[PDB]
Amino acid sequence: KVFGRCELAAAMKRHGLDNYRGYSLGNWVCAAKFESNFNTQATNRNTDGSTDYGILQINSRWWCNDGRTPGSRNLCNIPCSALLSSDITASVNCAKKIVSDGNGMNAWVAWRNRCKGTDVQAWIRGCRL
Secondary structure: EEEEEHHHHHHHHHHHOOOOOOOHHHHHHHHHHHHHHEEEOOOOOOOOOEEOOOOEEOOOOOEEEEEOOOOOOOOOOEEEHHHHOOOOOOHHHHHHHHHHOOOOOHHHHHHHHHHHHOOOOHHOOOOOO
């Protein structure tokens, strides 16, 4: 599925991301925009043997299990396939875990390199929430 910004914002808010651990909702929408262009099936296969999965491009070394990644920790306790669902449950819960494990949103390269410091609230402007 390819979300719209406002549709994604609303779903992320239903899943408890707005201001979660100090990250206003637009941060999460911005991260998704630049990680995956809002595509729930986005998949980036890296040369280290890990892969980034789903709308938030969560990586298979620390976070999800794909059985092909060296050093796997599966800290989200999910198959990476769950991160490719059209519903965002697993991706949001795993995103929450990433931050609960002490990583900021700096964990998402696209957030760091594109969203941080900007007017991220623009991503939710005009949306019904």
